């Protein structure tokens, strides 16, 4: 039921640099994931202009931030375009249209990790704070899939049943033990205000029930 894949070599190298470089300004991961969500929302907004039935899977365009202290997870949910199975494997597993090469060269020429979004690889900044990342996604043209990786050079993809989402993507960050500050309401609010205050879709920060 589960397929296991190797990252393209350059992607594994990039992930290793992100995981092993001493770099304290880890909060920038959230900006990068929210920007990726905003881009995905732009895409379905545009496609629905000439094909309104693409919103049959949900008209609302928004971003949800869901902390769970019991599971030690932070989840970033959007109702954007979503990804097909091929999209997951290509976009997360290979260089594809990213600036992976430019970023790694830039780091050797005076750039720092906070500039990762300039190079189209902001998603991998999740590994600044997460030991494992799970991506659940549903595109209008495919079934629901789950991508997962704890780095180390490989990732898995499986069909995801139970809790079907209408359309969009959930990025589930299983946080490192010493990065639980990013589950705290005050900290998340601070980061969103600092780095994501002009995003063109509603960002809702969920409250914990306990
Ligand atoms: C890992 C670096 N590559 C990407 O992030 C690409 O993966 C896709 N992607 C990333 N996040 C999302 C998302 N929330 N929704 C849809 N596609 C995404 C986009 O095509 C990105 O350009």
Swiss-Prot record:
Q: Which domain of life is it from?
A: Eukaryota
Annotated region Interaction with NR3C1: the residues are: 1-210
**GO annotation terms (biological process):** activation of innate immune response; cardiac muscle cell apoptotic process; cellular response to heat; cellular response to virus; chaperone-mediated autophagy; chaperone-mediated protein complex assembly; mitochondrial transport; neurofibrillary tangle assembly
In this chain, ATP is annotated as bound at 36, 78, 97, 123
N6-acetyllysine-modified residues are 43, 69
Provide the transmembrane region boundaries: none
Gene Ontology annotations for the cellular component aspect, listed alphabetically: apical plasma membrane; axonal growth cone; basolateral plasma membrane; brush border membrane; cell surface; cytoplasm; cytosol; dendritic growth cone
PTM text? ISGylated. S-nitrosylated; negatively regulates the ATPase activity and the activation of eNOS by HSP90AA1.
Q: Give the location in the cell.
A: Nucleus; Cytoplasm; Melanosome; Cell membrane
Q: Subunit comment for this entry?
A: Homodimer. Identified in NR3C1/GCR steroid receptor-chaperone complexes formed at least by NR3C1, HSP90AA1 and a variety of proteins containing TPR repeats such as FKBP4, FKBP5, PPID, PPP5C or STIP1. Forms a complex containing HSP90AA1, TSC1 and TSC2; TSC1 is required to recruit TCS2 to the complex. The closed form interacts (via the middle domain and TPR repeat-binding motif) with co-chaperone TSC1 (via C-terminus). Interacts with TOM34. Interacts with TERT; the interaction, together with PTGES3, is required for correct assembly and stabilization of the TERT holoenzyme complex. (Microbial infection) Interacts with herpes simplex virus 1 protein US11; this interaction inhibits TBK1-induced interferon production.
- Describe the family membership recorded for this protein in Swiss-Prot or TrEMBL: Belongs to the heat shock protein 90 family.
| The protein's name | Heat shock protein HSP 90-alpha
User: What organism is the protein native to?
Assistant: Homo sapiens (Human)
């Amino acid at each position: 039921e589960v397929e296991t894949f190797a990252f393209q070599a350059e992607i594994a190298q990039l992930m290793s640099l992100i995981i092993n470089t001493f770099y304290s300004n880890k909060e920038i991961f959230l900006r990068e994931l929210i920007s990726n969500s905003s881009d995905a929302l732009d895409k379905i907004r545009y496609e629905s202009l000439t094909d309104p039935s693409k919103l049959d899977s949900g008209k609302e365009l928004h971003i949800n931030l869901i902390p769970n202290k019991q599971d030690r997870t932070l989840t970033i949910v959007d109702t954007g375009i979503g990804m097909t199975k091929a999209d997951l494997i290509n976009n997360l597993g290979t260089i594809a249209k990213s600036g992976t090469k430019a970023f790694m060269e830039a780091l050797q020429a005076g750039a720092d990790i906070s500039m990762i979004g300039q190079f189209g690889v902001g998603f991998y900044s999740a590994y600044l704070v997460a030991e494992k990342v799970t991506v659940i996604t549903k595109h209008n043209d495919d079934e629901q899939y789950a991508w997962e990786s704890s780095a180390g050079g490989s990732f898995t993809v499986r069909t995801d049943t139970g809790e079907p989402m209408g359309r969009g993507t959930k990025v589930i960050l299983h946080l490192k033990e010493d990065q639980t500050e990013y589950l705290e309401e005050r900290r998340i609010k601070e980061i969103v205000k600092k780095h994501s205050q002009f995003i063109g879709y509603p960002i809702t920060l969920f409250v914990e029930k306990e």
